[PDB]
Structures are given as structure tokens and as C-alpha cells.
Design a protein around this ligand. Structure first.
Ligand code: SF4
Ligand SMILES: [Co+2]
Length: 242
């Protein structure tokens, strides 16, 4: 076997991909999440998945107003959490309630209480970051995309979350081959990207914005995309709408 970065080296213009995305879409980086406990960050990330930004934010507001401490959510059970989520709008309330409840119940029974503060105590070394990743991945229902998001957003650890928008753009740019699944795409990005948190955070913020707002699934805005000169797919889309 062979590292993904050797099977698939980044292009000569990779640095310009990073800098043009940052300059165009995130010239001033937003703050990462600094919640009292990473458990709150994890739950906030769960609310964001398969959801609009507006609904996820309303749900966070309503959920935390309803349950000022997570102990109250655990007592109210998945039915209570579901009702709370449903009241703020948005679907998948039953799925999300079960998922959140399962995390809380696991933490209470086996981790001494409703907290993920222990994630902050692992060393800030590649070995410690891997422990933090493994601990998030050991929570019931928590998949790799959410693990990467919590590491990057809540823990200041240099994971490399790649959302579906970013992946679509990466495949159109031919940064990664079409057949690679989302987890393999994340692994490739984590191998090739500069190791530092800030660069990785900047790519995630700017890449999500680019993929959502420019490299749209139907009708991408190639003429207005700063990556057009590097992109093998632009001509197909441009000539197509003509
Ligand atoms: S040129 Fe078009 S297809 Fe290529 S990255 Fe930009 S928006 Fe996406
Ligand atoms: Co048009």
C-alpha cells in the first residue's frame, strides 16, 4: 500500500486553491466555537447536520433554553428531546433526539457524567490528536464527519473536515478521483494539507462557502469562480448552459 498523497499528489496550483478560496470566501476568519464544554459543541454540530443554518441555530437556542443543563435533557428522554427539537422547526427530530439521548446516556453511565472536557486533556501532538479523534469516534452514533467537525471547531485540533459541498468541488477540480468515498476524500485532505489548525480551519470555512454558494450542484457559477482557470469541469458547465 501507499499513502493517498503519493497515489494522488496535489496539483502544482494547490497553494493557489487554498489562497484564492481564503481570499475570496473568508478574508476575515470567523471565531471557532468556544463553548463551556465540548459536549455542547458536539450537540450543536449534530443539530447542523442535514439541516439549514437558520433551523439549526433556532434549534440550538430552543434546546438550550429548554434544557439549561444536559442533565435535564437526559431526564426528559428521547421523546422530550424530540418534541423540543420539533418545536423549533425542521425535520429528523426523532433521529436527532435518539442520537443526542444516546450520547448523554452513554456519558452518564460510563464516563462519570455529562461532559467531554477530557477531550481537551490529550496532548497536542499527533498521538494526542488521534486519541481525541478515537474518543469522539467511540461515542454512539458519531461518524467521521462529525468527529472532524468537533476536533476543528471545538477543540482547536487540526482535523480536516470536508463537507459534501467541498467534496463536490474537489471532484470537479479533479483534486480527488470520482470514485473515492467521503471518508477517503477526508483522509486525502488530512494527508496533503499543511498541518496547522489555522490553515485547515480556513479551508473548511472558505471551502464550505465556495462549494455551497459558487460550485452549486445544479448551475454552478463557474464564470464567477476564482478557481476557474484550474478547473477541468468549468468548460463543461459553461458550454452546457449556452
Ligand atoms: S469552475 Fe465551476 S465546477 Fe470548477 S470549482 Fe469553480 S464553480 Fe466548481
Ligand atoms: Co445561468
Amino acid at each position: 500500500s501507499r499513502p493517498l498523497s503519493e497515489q494522488n499528489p496535489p496539483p502544482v496550483w494547490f497553494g493557489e486553491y487554498l489562497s484564492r478560496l481564503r481570499d475570496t470566501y473568508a478574508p476575515e476568519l470567523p471565531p471557532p466555537r468556544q463553548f463551556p464544554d465540548p459536549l455542547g459543541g458536539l450537540i450543536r454540530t449534530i443539530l447542523s447536520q442535514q439541516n439549514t443554518r437558520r433551523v439549526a441555530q433556532r434549534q440550538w437556542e430552543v434546546l438550550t433554553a429548554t434544557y439549561p443543563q444536559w442533565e435535564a435533557a437526559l431526564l426528559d428522554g428521547p421523546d422530550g428531546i424530540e418534541a423540543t427539537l420539533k418545536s423549533a422547526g425542521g425535520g429528523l427530530s426523532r433521529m436527532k433526539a435518539d442520537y443526542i439521548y444516546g450520547i448523554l446516556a452513554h456519558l452518564q453511565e460510563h464516563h462519570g457524567g455529562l461532559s467531554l472536557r477530557f477531550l481537551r486533556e490529550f496532548p497536542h501532538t499527533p498521538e494526542g490528536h488521534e486519541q481525541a479523534r478515537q474518543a469522539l469516534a467511540a461515542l454512539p452514533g458519531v461518524g467521521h464527519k462529525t468527529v472532524a467537525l468537533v476536533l476543528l471547531f471545538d477543540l482547536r485540533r487540526p482535523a480536516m473536515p470536508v463537507d459534501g459541498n467541498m467534496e463536490r468541488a474537489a471532484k470537479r477540480l479533479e483534486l480527488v478521483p470520482a470514485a473515492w468515498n467521503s471518508h477517503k476524500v477526508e483522509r486525502w485532505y488530512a494527508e496533503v494539507m499543511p498541518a496547522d489548525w489555522e490553515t485547515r480551519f480556513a479551508l473548511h470555512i472558505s471551502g464550505v462557502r465556495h462549494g455551497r454558494d459558487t460550485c452549486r450542484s445544479k448551475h454552478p457559477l463557474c464564470p464567477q469562480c476564482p478557481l476557474r482557470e484550474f478547473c477541468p469541469s468549468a468548460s463543461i458547465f459553461e458550454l452546457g448552459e449556452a
